[PDB]
Amino acid sequence: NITEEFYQSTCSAVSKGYLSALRTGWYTSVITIELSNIAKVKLIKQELDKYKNAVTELQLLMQFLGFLLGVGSAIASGVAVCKVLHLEGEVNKIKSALLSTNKAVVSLSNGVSVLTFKVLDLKNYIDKQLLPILNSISNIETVIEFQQKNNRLLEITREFSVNAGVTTPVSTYMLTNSELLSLINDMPITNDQKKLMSNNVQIVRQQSYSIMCIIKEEVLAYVVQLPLYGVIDTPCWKLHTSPLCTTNTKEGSNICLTRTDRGWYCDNAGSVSFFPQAETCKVQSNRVFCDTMNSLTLPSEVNLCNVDIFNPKYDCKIMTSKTDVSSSVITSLGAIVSCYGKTKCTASNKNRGIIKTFSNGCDYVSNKGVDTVSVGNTLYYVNKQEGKSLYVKGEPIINFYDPLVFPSDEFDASISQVNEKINQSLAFIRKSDEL
Amino acid sequence: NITEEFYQSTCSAVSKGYLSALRTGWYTSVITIELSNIAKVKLIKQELDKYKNAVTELQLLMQFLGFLLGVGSAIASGVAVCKVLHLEGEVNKIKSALLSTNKAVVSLSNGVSVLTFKVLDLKNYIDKQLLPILNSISNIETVIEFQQKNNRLLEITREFSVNAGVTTPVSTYMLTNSELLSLINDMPITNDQKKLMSNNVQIVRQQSYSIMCIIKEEVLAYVVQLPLYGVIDTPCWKLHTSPLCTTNTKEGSNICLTRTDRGWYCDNAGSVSFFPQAETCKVQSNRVFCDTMNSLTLPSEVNLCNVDIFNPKYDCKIMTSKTDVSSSVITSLGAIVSCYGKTKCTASNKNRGIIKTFSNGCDYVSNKGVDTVSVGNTLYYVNKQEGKSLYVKGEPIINFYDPLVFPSDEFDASISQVNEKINQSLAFIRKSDEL
Amino acid sequence: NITEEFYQSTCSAVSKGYLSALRTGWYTSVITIELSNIAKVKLIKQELDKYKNAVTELQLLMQFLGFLLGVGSAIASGVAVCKVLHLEGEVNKIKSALLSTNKAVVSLSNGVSVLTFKVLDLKNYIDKQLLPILNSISNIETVIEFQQKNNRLLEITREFSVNAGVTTPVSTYMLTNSELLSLINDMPITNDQKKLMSNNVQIVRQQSYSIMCIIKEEVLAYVVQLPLYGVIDTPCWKLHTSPLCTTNTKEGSNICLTRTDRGWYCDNAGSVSFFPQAETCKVQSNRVFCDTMNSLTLPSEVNLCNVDIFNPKYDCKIMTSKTDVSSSVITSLGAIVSCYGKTKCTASNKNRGIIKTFSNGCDYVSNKGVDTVSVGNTLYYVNKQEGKSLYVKGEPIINFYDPLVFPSDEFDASISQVNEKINQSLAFIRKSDEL
Numbered sequence A, B, C: 001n002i003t004e005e006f007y008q009s010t011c012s013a014v015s016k017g018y019l020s021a022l023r024t025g026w027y028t029s030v031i032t033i034e035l036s037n038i039a040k041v042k043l044i045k046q047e048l049d050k051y052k053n054a055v056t057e058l059q060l061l062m063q064f065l066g067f068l069l070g071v072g073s074a075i076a077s078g079v080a081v082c083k084v085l086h087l088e089g090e091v092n093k094i095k096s097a098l099l100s101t102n103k104a105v106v107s108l109s110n111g112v113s114v115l116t117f118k119v120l121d122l123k124n125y126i127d128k129q130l131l132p133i134l135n136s137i138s139n140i141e142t143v144i145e146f147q148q149k150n151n152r153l154l155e156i157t158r159e160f161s162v163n164a165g166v167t168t169p170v171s172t173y174m175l176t177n178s179e180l181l182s183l184i185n186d187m188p189i190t191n192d193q194k195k196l197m198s199n200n201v202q203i204v205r206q207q208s209y210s211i212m213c214i215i216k217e218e219v220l221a222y223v224v225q226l227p228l229y230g231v232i233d234t235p236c237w238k239l240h241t242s243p244l245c246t247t248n249t250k251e252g253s254n255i256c257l258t259r260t261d262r263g264w265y266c267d268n269a270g271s272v273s274f275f276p277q278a279e280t281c282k283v284q285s286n287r288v289f290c291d292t293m294n295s296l297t298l299p300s301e302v303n304l305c306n307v308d309i310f311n312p313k314y315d316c317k318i319m320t321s322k323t324d325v326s327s328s329v330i331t332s333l334g335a336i337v338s339c340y341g342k343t344k345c346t347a348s349n350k351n352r353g354i355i356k357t358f359s360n361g362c363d364y365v366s367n368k369g370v371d372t373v374s375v376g377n378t379l380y381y382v383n384k385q386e387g388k389s390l391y392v393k394g395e396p397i398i399n400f401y402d403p404l405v406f407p408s409d410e411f412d413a414s415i416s417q418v419n420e421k422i423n424q425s426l427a428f429i430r431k432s433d434e435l
Ligand SMILES: O=c1n(Cc2nc3ccccc3n2CCCCO)c2cnccc2n1C1CC1
Pocket: A064, A067, A410, A411, B067, B411, B412, C064, C067, C319, C320, C321, C409, C410, C411, C412
């Protein structure tokens, strides 16, 4: 299962063992609620005005390397469908197909065959239960049943109200679990995809959008926009990097280097999907949920940067500085510690206290027997996930650089770019020498 | 209406056709709820203890270029009013003016004439409905009416609880739609401003704050802080930029350049308001809602950077790198595609599939007939907004630069700054030549 | 109390007078709800199916200098406990200890002695109130009491549903105020710590996590993860910095410099905790709530950068540019104004209007008599906190630099790094001179 290697030479760690679940596409579907246009009945008269107020609100609704990412439009697929429902006869084409069945496909005269779904029939209820008796007296409940149907409308309306028509995650009121699962059952997708979504509906919900579309002809329509997971069960690995600095006694005489390529990496279609912001990803035990909108597509060679950062096949990205501050990175199965200067850095067991005091430099410790890590005044709990760690001994590459000609304000840089800068300044040095 | 030009020479696009709605100021108003200090009645006894618990909770409450932005204090206007209500007699000055009318102006003895507003009178209700009968028996409902008044208190209290006294957006419980609209009617603002806010109350709500102020003398007061839109119906345009790189076969021999000045631009008072984070802005069809807190004020000359980026009147901002990664930017009426290296970049129609395969470089495609764009493993839906696009053919300016003396780690840079760097290094070259 | 000095020489301001409250550790505790496994009764039959649906949802849940910060794992302490509850007999060890008392310590056979707490006993209720009568008829309410117990379950379930098992802030449904306060009473902490948390429960709530742990053996368990405030009542001060530029008439001939070390500073354990993102901190009157996860530990010498930025004991961090844009920073007791170019910058009184027009450069004004500040098209309200300001006159240090050899794209830089860059280029100049 989960494993982790630490590289002393580059102050970085890789956690492998994970399986992908990447949102690669969207599945849109039109969700409809049909509406009515209007002593134990005083309850019903109350709920009935809660009703009109919701309808009223609804009508008011009308009238390091992350900077390298592109810029999408997350709900462009859903709004594309909404804009079509505004065509005339298009709300009736839906209203007609959803007469004798609660789920139908409406060819929207735009290209898409959209799955339409009537989740709530208030129009029918109010007109075939409340309307005949509103012409004084109430039976049994009924009162209960209406309060339940209606409350859902109020919840949906409250969400669209506070979010100005677009919500996420998709609540159980936008789409109940039984509705969602039947939607999943009728998706043109592999059985693996269906079981993945069913075992993780709340994650699925979190990657979905609900877009308020239209109120017209006693019908409320919103578009639910669900994730397509086109990439599933491919290898994933997370890269943790921390500043690697020299440790000369004299303050400010030090140089530093950080691999800037931290994030999630997943094998994808012959390339590797890279996610520079490792919080656009959510881990569940050993399954990594990601969104390809927040990714770059890179050559698979990129993994060579961990094995060997000076390699000729991929140019590994680094940043440089003279800023030797202490800090820690909490990995999947341990902790990276960049201890510099006068800082007090330790690792501790819950019951025994400090078991390791860190030297200046960059070091690593596994969660096996260690509960917390301390850098300066910052206490970090480590992840207590079960796995195996490997410490890969090696000379910190920062020691291979002469501080005199080291370039120290590079951010969008790399190993070859830095060497190029060094060569250039050694050229100048050997040319003034001959003077 | 909406239109868009793409500039091949600078890998950028401008969407024009939009109308401004900029929050330029705040409108504060004190909102008050008067409180009471204490078999079908067992319901009322229940709601009455829900009441005391809310009061209890309430009392506990007491005792690219974005880095160039300034730093405001969003609720400083509202807290300014709150701090005054803590003066003595100031809660009574309010409580006295709101005796026979539900809406009054209280001169707060600080300068401001604040609009005071009593939205809920629980004190009166409990003491003139529940208190006389609590001395055993219940009439009719009444039970219903109290549950409704009280539920609002509980909703307001829940919001102030989970947000530690400051909430946004302002919910329909903080301020109902009928209350908000009457507030809007009595605002010292132009009719255009009133219709704008009325046609978009949920957006208005989203730009408002609710600040819990005080509980004192059987009175709950919070300050609602509503947006003033001082700039309305002025031209707006959004700028989309993407990395422009050379495309030499040999990996890593390439240079790149990105216009760093993407964002919203709105004509404002003889200058142009620039919003570097184009998600501090929300578009509704063709109206752009923005906040001037998140803006810079620039010369109107800034638009010349699109027509002609080498112009003498404004120095256009760019960043440089050697990092030729592929990506896409989804514009208002199409997509910009920066395809580099081995990446597979295409555009597709829903029903027909791939209709264009992109060459290495920077290119553009309109939403007219194109539904999705693909860069590497990333599928992007384009916006299906109705508009007209224009492709402005031109030589990519990156081809005008000799890679040998190109400065490649500039972020906070510009066209003239880069030329200055180039001149300097050509000076050195022509001085070593004469050796 | 609160005071503020402005430094004209470096365009910066320091607000002192604050007292710390730093989350330094976590306090975890297992919270349990015991569950049942199954005409006025039609209400109860309703609430009973709301019940089963919640249980159903719950079971589905199973199966400038911020870039210098380290990377923690916020809920690693809580999940550590959760993973233990999944051991066998571990849910029964809890269920057994919580038989005759509602609060017990369960030695989890892992090391920790965790505080276990049964907040809601639905199993007992349903089986000792509803189950004997479900074998037709209902007494009194009871109906009310069940609706209240059950509603809490539904609220807890709704939160865990929409947040996929991890929530924050911890709601009054996860943990009521009376439960929280008893938890606080039994914490191994100083009386100062207890009074601090009791006077600020909503802030405490905002720094807490609730982590859904397990459903097993008619028991629901979640881990509430509360903040430990190990540092309390130590001096804090916030640093405000703004761009300091030259003001030569000719556009683009100017140089700029910004102290990049803005944020919160708190005295902590012989060092100083620095918080580069001053919105990971929340002020309540004069108490600063912070999280040490978002901090660096620095030498106490760092405060010398305000007194004297050219000092030999700490190297003060600055960034440089040629980008002279106007902006403002709203401080605790006034405003910093960086006015450059053609921008219109003013300060105004509510009742009197413009009382100061700013010259080009960097200037400051206190909240005493000033209500708003205007830079370009941006209106800023100042904070109306009561305090004393001091303007420290001084030559802006930017005027000490020759523009010809000034390094203008440094971000991760400092005063000594810049001088070093200058010396190097003056070396080259004096060596070409002798030619
Ligand atoms: O995003 C960046 N940049 C880009 C960058 N370069 C610059 C040069 C001069 C002036 C400003 C510059 N900025 C803007 C940084 C604004 C952060 O709030 C960085 C440069 N050096 C070190 C870390 C950097 N990061 C971190 C990932 C957050």
